Design a protein around this ligand. Sequence first.
Ligand SMILES: COc1ccc(CN)cc1OC
Length: 281
Amino acid sequence: EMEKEFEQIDKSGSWAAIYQDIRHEASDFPSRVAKLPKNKNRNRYRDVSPFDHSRIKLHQEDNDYINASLIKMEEAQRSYILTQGPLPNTVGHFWEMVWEQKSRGVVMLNRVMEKGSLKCAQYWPQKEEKEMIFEDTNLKLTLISEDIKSYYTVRQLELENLTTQETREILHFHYTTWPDFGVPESPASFLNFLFKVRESGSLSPEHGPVVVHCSAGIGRSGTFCLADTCLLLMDKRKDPSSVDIKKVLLEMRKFRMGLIQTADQLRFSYLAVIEGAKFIM
Ligand SMILES: COc1ccc(CN)cc1OC
């Protein structure tokens, strides 16, 4: 059981050691499309690339590339798109991916500015009456409503395909209180946020995969998917304690490199799953 394993690693201070075994065991697959010189300005970080086998392809003949990966968790019947925070030049590609994949929710785990630098382009409208048009991808985005709470904001957006005049409602879930350094002290507000995404229907098989991002799409984004999948597996299996976080993380790392960036994020993931299990048992 992971609660016991938690106290062991914690009392022994072995987090950096566990974290290193994960780095050494992790899959390595080609990422040739990401490294093409024509894609250099579609990547926020030169060392964070989608694998070719799991990359999301845009349906535009010109250049199909976006820094985005499909995570498929077969046993949990869960799928997530993990992506980077869009760049000024990829905001149109981001919304094209949301459209093409039939996603219902976007989960954002960063602020636009952190540590005095831009981590993400402002890719949604700030006011109802000021909609955004993405000329490159022929989409219009309107803010319908915004509900600001202490730890997170939920926004209802309307995405319109200008080519076909179809419209869809997208939910934007914005976790606004992840600290600039380190991890939250308590996982309570993060669990509340994760249960709110679940309640919306955004993680349900009747929609395309949820889009999850932070700045690189590997650290905070990784914690989100890892916690959701682990808690789901605990409700599915005859023996809940058969759930090994480290195994689940290694499975997800077959689909996108580097998920969970620090030993602190790993410890936080254990804590979130351990605490979430109480509200699930
Ligand atoms: C909605 O369907 C499911 C989603 C997840 C699981 C988890 N093993 C089982 C399901 O069966 C129905």
